[PDB]
Amino acid sequence: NSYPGCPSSYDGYCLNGGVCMHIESLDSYTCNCVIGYSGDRCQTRDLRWWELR
């Protein structure tokens, strides 16, 4: 499952211009981005239609 969360443990898990959201699969934290960026945050500065609507 996935859940919105981002404690103060870190600081700027998302770069370029993304939003932070937590995961419950590995109790890990991740970050979403926009066209021209994705991955664990915004590292994959690529196109790659990875979204809809």
Range of the domain at 25: 1-53
> Structural domain tally of the chain?
1
In contact, 44 and 24? CB cutoff 8 Å: no
Give every CB contact of residue 1 below 8 A, 6+ residues apart in sequence. Answer: 23, 24, 25
* CATH code of residue 24: 2.10.25.10
- For 50, the token pair is 């990875």
**Dist CA 24 CA 29 (whole Å):** 8
Method used to obtain the model: NMR
Q: Write out the two tokens for 35.
A: 């066209």
Query: Tell me, what amino acid is at 31?
Result: C
Is residue 4 within 8 A of residue 32, CB to CB? The reply is: no
Q: Which helix (H) or strand (E) covers residue 10, if one does?
A: none
| Element at 23 (helix H, strand E) | strand 19-23
